[PDB]
Amino acid sequence: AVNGKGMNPDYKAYLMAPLKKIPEVTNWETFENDLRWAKQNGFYAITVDFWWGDMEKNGDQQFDFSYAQRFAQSVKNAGMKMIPIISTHQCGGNVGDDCNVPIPSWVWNQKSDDSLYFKSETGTVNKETLNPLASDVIRKEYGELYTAFAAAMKPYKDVIAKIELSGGPAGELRYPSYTTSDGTGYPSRGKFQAYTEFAKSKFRLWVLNKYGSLNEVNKAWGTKLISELAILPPSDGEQFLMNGYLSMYGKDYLEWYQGILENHTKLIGELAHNAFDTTFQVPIGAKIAGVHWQYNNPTIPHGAEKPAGYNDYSHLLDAFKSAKLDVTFTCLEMTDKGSYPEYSMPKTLVQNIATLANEKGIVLNGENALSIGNEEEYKRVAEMAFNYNFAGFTLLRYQDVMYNNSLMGKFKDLLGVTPVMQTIVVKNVPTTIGDTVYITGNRAELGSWDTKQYPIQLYYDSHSNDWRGNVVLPAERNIEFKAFIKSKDGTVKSWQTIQQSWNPVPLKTTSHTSSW
Ligand SMILES: OC[C@H]1O[C@H](O)[C@H](O)[C@@H](O)[C@@H]1O
Ligand SMILES: [Ca+2]
């Protein structure tokens, strides 16, 4: 892996359940057998959406957790674990959505202003999720929902391995900047979603708070605004994305815009920890979307990310570490293109996020954005997951592998692996002063024969005059590898004479000794 390390010893694979309730797909018995089959193939748990539109449909505080309980009961019967996603967003209307579960319709009547929803640069209203600006309503409803959920699921704490939170549209922490009705669907640029009267005044107040008076504002922005009412979000999103973002106004606007999501992250993190920490004692996380299109567009750089709320990922992630939430990213199966008209750079994106996450010490999890129907994609996922320290991978989605034996088998071999610590010992290595020894192998968890970025470093043993190290390996899988010497400058000086192999890697910790 990167930095001479190996795969994450805590790696676990998860399976995303269908969007529709199980009884609308098959029966519970078959479901239980499907789970036992999944477990046999390396899946640790099944993650599932529990829709707010289902749990508090009739009215405020009129809960119904019977479905969530019946689902959990079956997960228990199968001897599996589950990861519930408290989906406080709408199901249906997004790419791949085969459901129709809006959030409770009564929530919209709790405000007379337009503080609860979104409005784009061109007036398109969006109600897939509550506007994070309405922190008073979010604090009340999410607060009540989480606590009620914890109480109702207390009997099933032993099957709950983790809890995922929904931070916005499609359960991702972002603005609904790419939708069909707003004319911003992939791969178009996104539109900013801060044009409700409420959003405009919040921005205005934020600016005035930072500068004190319109006079200081004009001085800081180099503008000549005639009155406080002139403080507004961009009038032309495209012109803003072309060069307006470079100005002091631009920096302030984007800071406030992304700031709304960071504060939201801290709020739901606090509500979630207060409601689950004592009862479940399990990790909690949220998701960041992989808005990979228009990444390297020369005309409108990061033309889709910025409107979605992503302008400074490093700053964004600090909010996660601060809220004590793990992060889940997407598009781990795609590769870079960066060509007109999509200007898509998914891999470069995932690499940047993973790097930042690791620096800050944030537990990183991944998912694939689109269904995988070929072994080649699993390989790319494996490359990113095992060489960028991912702690988990969730496969979207259930049916893709449950009704395709060959694909399921390829997932088990490549991704449904159990990491096991092993000692590698290499003797008779002709190292000179300054040289270092590394190992690299055929599988992704071994760097796929890469000697530049992914090799696994070994450590000289002065007492036995050999090189060794504890490496995390995929249990019960065949591997081939070779040690090599790297000069003090970074060039590969030589390789081990004979290629080594372990067919397969034992599941009990032991050691593999070979000679140069
Ligand atoms: O906009 C939603 C979807 O659009 C396209 O299908 C992209 O390939 C995918 O990554 C994204 O999730
Ligand atoms: Ca409520």
Side-chain angles (χ1 to χ4, degrees):
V2 174
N3 297 161
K5 307 166 181 181
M7 73 186 274
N8 192 305
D10 298 313
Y11 175 80
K12 291 188 177 62
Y14 310 114
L15 219 203
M16 261 261 79
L19 291 175
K20 290 184 183 177
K21 298 188 180 176
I22 300 308
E24 309 182 306
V25 178
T26 180
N27 59 279
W28 293 110
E29 184 190 305
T30 300
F31 175 64
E32 281 169 18
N33 289 168
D34 278 357
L35 291 178
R36 284 190 266 265
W37 172 231
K39 186 173 186 178
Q40 276 183 60
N41 291 88
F43 285 111
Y44 182 68
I46 184 170
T47 78
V48 52
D49 293 270
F50 284 139
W51 307 101
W52 186 18
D54 284 330
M55 302 186 284
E56 187 175 23
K57 171 192 269 294
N58 300 322
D60 186 34
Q61 301 313 85
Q62 275 181 281
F63 297 119
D64 180 27
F65 298 104
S66 61
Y67 175 67
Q69 299 179 304
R70 180 68 184 83
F71 181 109
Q73 183 58 245
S74 273
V75 165
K76 170 189 280 296
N77 298 335
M80 270 285 261
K81 298 298 188 61
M82 66 180 272
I83 291 175
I85 304 178
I86 299 172
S87 304
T88 43
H89 63 279
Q90 169 178 303
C91 194
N94 276 143
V95 61
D97 280 19
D98 172 47
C99 51
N100 178 214
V101 187
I103 67 176
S105 62
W106 55 261
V107 76
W108 304 112
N109 296 316
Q110 284 204 165
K111 289 285 186 178
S112 306
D113 52 26
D114 57 359
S115 66
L116 263 33
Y117 53 82
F118 306 80
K119 202 159 186 180
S120 80
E121 303 174 18
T122 56
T124 303
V125 175
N126 182 294
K127 297 186 174 184
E128 296 182 54
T129 189
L130 263 27
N131 188 316
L133 235 25
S135 58
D136 61 317
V137 172
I138 289 170
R139 170 158 239 134
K140 176 186 179 295
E141 305 311 325
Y142 285 32
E144 301 173 319
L145 181 59
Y146 296 170
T147 61
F149 184 81
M153 299 304 278
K154 185 186 303 180
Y156 301 102
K157 72 162 299 173
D158 65 310
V159 304
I160 293 178
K162 178 180 180 190
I163 298 181
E164 282 297 315
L165 278 21
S166 169
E172 309 169 309
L173 179 82
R174 61 175 178 84
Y175 288 106
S177 62
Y178 48 99
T179 62
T180 298
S181 46
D182 197 39
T184 55
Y186 167 95
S188 307
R189 80 168 180 88
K191 281 177 182 175
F192 290 101
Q193 308 291 313
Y195 299 81
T196 45
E197 287 312 313
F198 195 71
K200 292 175 176 179
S201 63
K202 302 307 290 191
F203 176 49
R204 178 153 41 243
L205 271 34
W206 181 85
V207 173
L208 258 20
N209 174 261
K210 171 173 176 175
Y211 295 118
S213 61
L214 183 67
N215 215 70
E216 291 307 75
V217 174
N218 282 323
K219 170 148 65 68
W221 294 353
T223 58
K224 202 112 297 181
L225 285 49
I226 231 64
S227 88
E228 290 80 6
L229 290 300
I231 296 173
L232 303 161
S235 298
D236 187 328
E238 170 149 289
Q239 178 271 153
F240 181 79
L241 294 171
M242 280 177 65
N243 46 234
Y245 68 97
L246 293 169
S247 66
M248 269 306 315
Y249 162 75
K251 287 180 169 54
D252 284 336
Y253 176 70
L254 291 174
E255 184 187 318
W256 169 76
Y257 196 61
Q258 179 174 304
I260 301 308
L261 295 177
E262 298 174 334
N263 287 336
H264 184 55
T265 296
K266 301 178 184 181
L267 172 60
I268 61 178
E270 174 191 302
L271 299 178
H273 279 297
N274 284 164
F276 311 123
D277 285 354
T278 52
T279 300
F280 297 109
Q281 297 166 288
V282 301
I284 305 171
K287 310 180 188 180
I288 286 170
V291 185
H292 63 267
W293 57 103
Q294 295 315 321
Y295 184 102
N296 66 312
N297 182 141
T299 294
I300 48 171
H302 298 290
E305 291 158 277
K306 300 181 182 183
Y310 309 149
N311 182 61
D312 182 330
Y313 292 113
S314 179
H315 198 284
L316 210 203
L317 288 174
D318 292 332
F320 273 74
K321 178 167 198 55
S322 180
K324 285 179 288 181
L325 295 173
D326 299 335
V327 58
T328 294
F329 196 61
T330 66
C331 301
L332 264 67
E333 84 279 29
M334 308 179 173
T335 59
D336 286 337
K337 297 178 184 302
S339 61
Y340 176 88
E342 308 92 330
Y343 287 113
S344 173
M345 302 294 272
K347 191 179 183 177
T348 295
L349 186 55
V350 180
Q351 282 173 165
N352 297 170
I353 297 302
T355 296
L356 289 172
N358 291 316
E359 297 180 3
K360 304 172 185 298
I362 299 172
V363 176
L364 185 66
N365 299 283
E367 303 186 326
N368 53 299
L370 272 38
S371 291
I372 292 176
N374 131 301
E375 175 176 57
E376 187 48 50
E377 261 111 58
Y378 289 151
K379 288 186 181 174
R380 295 172 199 155
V381 174
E383 176 185 344
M384 301 308 289
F386 305 136
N387 292 95
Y388 286 85
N389 203 218
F390 280 76
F393 176 69
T394 302
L395 177 73
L396 278 64
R397 186 185 299 281
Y398 195 91
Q399 321 74 181
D400 302 327
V401 293
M402 208 64 75
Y403 307 145
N404 184 153
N405 295 162
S406 77
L407 208 48
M408 175 68 95
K410 295 188 183 303
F411 174 91
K412 173 171 173 298
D413 180 53
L414 294 165
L415 299 163
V417 305
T418 295
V420 61
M421 196 65 77
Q422 297 292 176
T423 306
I424 302 298
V425 186
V426 183
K427 309 184 90 74
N428 310 306
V429 192
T431 51
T432 195
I433 185 65
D435 292 328
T436 301
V437 186
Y438 294 75
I439 60 170
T440 182
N442 59 168
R443 293 183 56 99
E445 35 275 89
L446 286 168
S448 295
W449 295 125
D450 179 284
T451 66
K452 314 301 168 56
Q453 310 190 71
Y454 313 144
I456 305 173
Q457 184 182 292
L458 255 40
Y459 302 81
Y460 181 61
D461 178 324
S462 63
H463 298 198
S464 59
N465 185 48
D466 58 38
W467 292 75
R468 52 159 63 66
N470 278 188
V471 188
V472 184
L473 297 173
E476 315 196 79
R477 295 288 180 293
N478 299 325
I479 63 177
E480 306 213 307
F481 62 92
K482 296 185 69 169
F484 64 97
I485 295 179
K486 218 169 184 176
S487 57
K488 56 180 183 57
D489 63 64
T491 51
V492 176
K493 299 208 303 181
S494 57
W495 292 82
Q496 183 171 192
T497 307
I498 303 304
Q499 178 158 301
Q500 300 306 301
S501 69
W502 215 341
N503 310 298
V505 176
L507 47 172
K508 81 295 289 80
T509 298
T510 174
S511 81
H512 178 106
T513 306
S514 64
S515 170
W516 185 263

